[PDB]
Amino acid sequence: KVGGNYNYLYRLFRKSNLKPFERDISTEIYQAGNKPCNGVAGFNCYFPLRSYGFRPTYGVGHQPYRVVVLSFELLHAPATVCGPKKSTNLVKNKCVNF
Amino acid sequence: SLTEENAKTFLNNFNQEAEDLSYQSSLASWNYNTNITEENAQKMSEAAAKWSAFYEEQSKTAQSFSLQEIQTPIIKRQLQALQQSGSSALSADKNKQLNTILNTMSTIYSTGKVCNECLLLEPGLDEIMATSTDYNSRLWAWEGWRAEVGKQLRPLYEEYVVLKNEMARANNYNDYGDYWRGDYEAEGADGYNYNRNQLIEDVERTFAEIKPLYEHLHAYVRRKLMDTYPSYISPTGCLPAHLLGDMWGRFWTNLYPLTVPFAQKPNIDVTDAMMNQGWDAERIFQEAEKFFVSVGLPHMTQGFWANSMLTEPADGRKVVCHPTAWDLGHGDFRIKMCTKVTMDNFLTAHHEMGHIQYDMAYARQPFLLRNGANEGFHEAVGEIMSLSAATPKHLKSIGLLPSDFQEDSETEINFLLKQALTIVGTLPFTYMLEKWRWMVFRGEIPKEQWMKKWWEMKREIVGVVEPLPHDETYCDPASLFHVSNDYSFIRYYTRTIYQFQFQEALCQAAKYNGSLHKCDISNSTEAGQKLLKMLSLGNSEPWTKALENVVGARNMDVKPLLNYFQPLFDWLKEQNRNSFVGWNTEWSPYAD
Ligand SMILES: *[C@@H]1O[C@H](CO)[C@@H](O)[C@H](O)[C@H]1NC(C)=O
Numbered sequence: 001k002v003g004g005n006y007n008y009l010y011r012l013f014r015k016s017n018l019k020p021f022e023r024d025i026s027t028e029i030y031q032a033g034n035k036p037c038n039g040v041a042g043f044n045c046y047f048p049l050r051s052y053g054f055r056p057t058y059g060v061g062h063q064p065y066r067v068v069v070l071s072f073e074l075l076h077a078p079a080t081v082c083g084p085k086k087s088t089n090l091v092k093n094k095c096v097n098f
Numbered sequence: 099s100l101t102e103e104n105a106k107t108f109l110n111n112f113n114q115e116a117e118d119l120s121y122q123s124s125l126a127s128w129n130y131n132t133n134i135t136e137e138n139a140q141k142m143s144e145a146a147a148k149w150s151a152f153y154e155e156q157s158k159t160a161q162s163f164s165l166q167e168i169q170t171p172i173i174k175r176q177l178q179a180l181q182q183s184g185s186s187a188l189s190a191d192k193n194k195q196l197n198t199i200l201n202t203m204s205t206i207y208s209t210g211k212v213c214n215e216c217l218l219l220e221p222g223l224d225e226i227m228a229t230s231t232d233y234n235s236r237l238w239a240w241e242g243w244r245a246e247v248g249k250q251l252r253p254l255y256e257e258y259v260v261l262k263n264e265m266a267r268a269n270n271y272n273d274y275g276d277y278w279r280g281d282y283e284a285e286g287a288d289g290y291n292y293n294r295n296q297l298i299e300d301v302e303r304t305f306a307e308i309k310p311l312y313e314h315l316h317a318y319v320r321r322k323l324m325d326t327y328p329s330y331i332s333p334t335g336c337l338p339a340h341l342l343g344d345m346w347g348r349f350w351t352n353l354y355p356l357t358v359p360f361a362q363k364p365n366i367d368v369t370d371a372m373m374n375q376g377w378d379a380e381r382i383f384q385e386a387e388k389f390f391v392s393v394g395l396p397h398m399t400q401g402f403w404a405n406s407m408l409t410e411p412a413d414g415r416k417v418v419c420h421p422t423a424w425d426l427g428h429g430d431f432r433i434k435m436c437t438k439v440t441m442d443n444f445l446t447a448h449h450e451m452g453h454i455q456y457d458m459a460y461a462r463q464p465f466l467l468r469n470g471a472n473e474g475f476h477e478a479v480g481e482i483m484s485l486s487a488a489t490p491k492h493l494k495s496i497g498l499l500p501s502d503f504q505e506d507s508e509t510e511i512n513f514l515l516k517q518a519l520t521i522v523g524t525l526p527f528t529y530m531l532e533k534w535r536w537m538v539f540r541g542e543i544p545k546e547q548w549m550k551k552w553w554e555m556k557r558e559i560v561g562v563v564e565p566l567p568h569d570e571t572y573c574d575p576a577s578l579f580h581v582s583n584d585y586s587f588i589r590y591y592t593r594t595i596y597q598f599q600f601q602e603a604l605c606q607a608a609k610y611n612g613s614l615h616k617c618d619i620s621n622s623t624e625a626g627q628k629l630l631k632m633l634s635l636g637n638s639e640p641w642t643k644a645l646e647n648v649v650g651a652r653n654m655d656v657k658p659l660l661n662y663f664q665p666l667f668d669w670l671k672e673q674n675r676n677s678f679v680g681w682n683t684e685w686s687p688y689a690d
Pocket residue numbers: 132133135137413415
C-alpha cells in the first residue's frame with residue numbers, strides 16, 4: 001500500500017530461540033534488563049512484535065515475499081495422500097499387459 | 099546480564115525504528131522536491147521534526163552506555179555514532195539564541211543586494227563577476243557586496259562564533275573547529291587510529307607539496323591577465339580579489355577565456371555530436387549504467403528507472419533542479435536533475451550515479467554506519483568516475499567522438515589547464531579559509547584583528563590582495579555561502595586529494611600505461627572489485643583502513659595529485675621562465 005501496509009507483524013526479540021515447528025503468539029514486553037517491566041515500554045523493556053512498512057517504492061529485497069513450505073510426513077500410519085496415475089487402452093482380441 | 103548484550107539489543111531496536119523513520123522523512127522530502135507545494139512542504143517538515151525528535155530522544159537514552167564496557171568494536175562504534183548529542187547540549191535559551199542568529203545570517207545572505215544598477219547575488223552579481231572584464235565594473239560590485247553583507251553580518255557573526263564555541267565546549271570539546279575536525283577522527287588498532295589534532299599537522303604538510311604547482315599556475319595567470327589589465331597588475335605582485343573570475347575566488351574556471359594555452363585548438367565538446375545521433379536523458383543514463391557495470395559494479399535497481407526523476411517534469415511541476423542523489427532506504431535510490439543533452443550534464447550524470455553506487459554498497463552495514471568513511475570520501479568516489487568517463491578514449495568507445503580523431507598535445511595541455519584552474523586553484527583558497535576559521539574559533543586571532551589577519555593571510559597563501567582597504571568594520575569571511583550558512587569547508591581539500599588518490603590507486607591496478615589523466619577504467623573488472631572493497635565498509639571501519647584498502651596508505655597523499663598535472667606542470671615551468679614565480683606581500687592596488 002502507498003501509505004504502508006503495517007498489518008503484517010514479525011517478532012524481533014525473544015528469550016531463547018524456537019524449536020522445530022513452534023509458534024509463539026504472546027505479546028509480552030521483552031524483559032531485556034534486570035528492571036522488571038510493568039507492562040509499559042521504554043528503557044530495557046521493548047515490544048517484541050514490530051510491523052512491516054511494506055510500500056510499493058521499496059526495492060526487491062524489502063518488498064513483500066510470500067513463502068510456503070510443504071513438509072511431508074511418513075508415519076507408520078497408512079498413506080492417504082497419493083499422487084496421480086493413468087493411461088488409456090481397453091485393447092481387445094490381443095494379449096497385452098494389464 | 100552483561101551490558102554488551104543490552105547495548106546490542108538497544109541498537110537493534112534503534113536501527114529497526116530508524117530504518118523506518120528516516121525512510122519516511124526522506125520520502126516526504128522527495129515528494130516535496132518533486133512538486134514543491136505548501137502541503138508537501140508541511141508534510142516534509144513534520145516528518146523531519148518527528149525524525150529529529152526520535153533521534154534526539156534515542157541519543158539522550160543512549161548516553162547511559164559508556165563505551166568502556168562495550169567490547170565488540172562494531173557495537174561500540176554503533177553506540178558512539180549515536181551518543182554524540184551535538185546542538186542539544188546547550189540550554190533551551192542558548193539553543194534558541196543560536197538558531198535565531200543562524201537564521202538571521204542565512205536570511206541576510208539570501209536577501210543581499212548591492213546597488214551603486216540594483217541587482218541581487220545570483221541574478222546580476224554572479225554573471226557580472228564571471229563574464230565582465232572591466233576593472234571598475236567588477237571592483238564596485240565586489241566592494242559593495244563585501245561592505246554590505248560583511249558589515250551586516252559582522253555583529254551577528256561575532257556572537258554566533260561565541261555561541262558555537264560554547265556549544266562545542268558543552269559537548270566535551272574545546273572549540274567549534276575541533277567539533278568540525280571530529281569527522282576525521284578514527285579509532286581502531288595502533289595503525290588505524292587517527293586523532294583530530296593530527297589533521298592540523300597533515301593539511302599543512304599536504305599543502306607545502308602543492309605550493310610549486312600553484313605558484314607556477316598563479317604566475318601564468320598573472321602574465322596572461324596583464325594584457326586585459328595593463329594598469330592593474332604588477333609583474334611581481336599579487337592578484338586583486340575582484341579579478342579572479344568570482345566574487346571570492348573559490349574557482350578560477352571563469353578565467354579560461356583570458357588564460358588559454360592554445361586558442362587555435364579549443365576544447366572538445368560532444369554536445370553537437372550527442373544531438374546528431376538523437377540521444378536523450380534516458381540514453382545518457384543508460385550509457386552511464388553501462389560504464390558503471392563495465393568496471394564490475396552491481397546493476398542499478400529496477401526502481402531507479404521508474405520512480406526516479408531523471409528529466410525535467412513537463413506536467414508543470416516546479417523542481418529545485420540541482421543534481422542530487424537520494425538514497426531513501428530499503429532499496430530505494432533515485433537521482434533528481436533536469437538532465438539534458440549537454441556535455442557538462444552528461445558528466446554530472448556519471449558523477450551523481452557514483453553517489454548512488456556508493457549508497458548501494460554500504461547498504462549491508464547497520465543503519466548507524468550507512469555513510470562514507472568521512473565527509474571527504476563520499477564526494478570523492480563520484481568525481482573519479484567523471485575523470486575516467488570524460489577522457490578522449492572513452493568518448494570514442496561510446497561513439498561520441500569519431501575514430502579518425504587523434505589525441506593532440508596542445509588540446510591535451512588546454513584540457514589540463516582548464517582542469518587545474520578549477521582543481522588546483524580551489525585548494526589554496528579552501529586551505530586558507532579553513533586555517534583562518536580554525537584560528538578564529540580557537541581565539542588565537544583577537545576579535546580586534548579579524549579582517550587584518552584575514553587579508554594578511556590572503557596574501558601569503560592564496561596570493562590575493564584587496565583593491566581597497568578594509569579595516570575591522572567589515573567581515574569578508576562571512577560574505578561566503580559556507581561561512582554564513584553553517585557548513586564545513588575543509589571537506590573540499592580532503593575530497594580533492596582523495597579523488598586523485600583513488601584515481602591513481604585504481605588506475606595502477608588496471609595496468610594502464612600512460613598519463614594519469616588519460617586513464618580509462620572501463621573494460622576492467624579488477625578496477626571495480628578493488629573499489630567495492632572500500633565502498634562496502636562505509637563507516638564500519640576507521641577511514642584509515644578504508645583508505646588503505648584502496649590506495650594502501652593510511653593518510654592523505656598529495657604525490658598522486660602532482661602526477662595528474664605533470665605534463666601541464668612542465669609546460670608551465672617552461673613557459674613561466676621569463677618571470678618570477680611568486681609574489682611579494684607588500685604590493686597594494688589601493689596604495690600609490
Ligand atoms: C503537484 O502538487 C499537487 C498538490 O498541490 C498534487 O496533488 C499533485 O499530485 C502533484 N503532482 C505530482 C506529484 O505529480
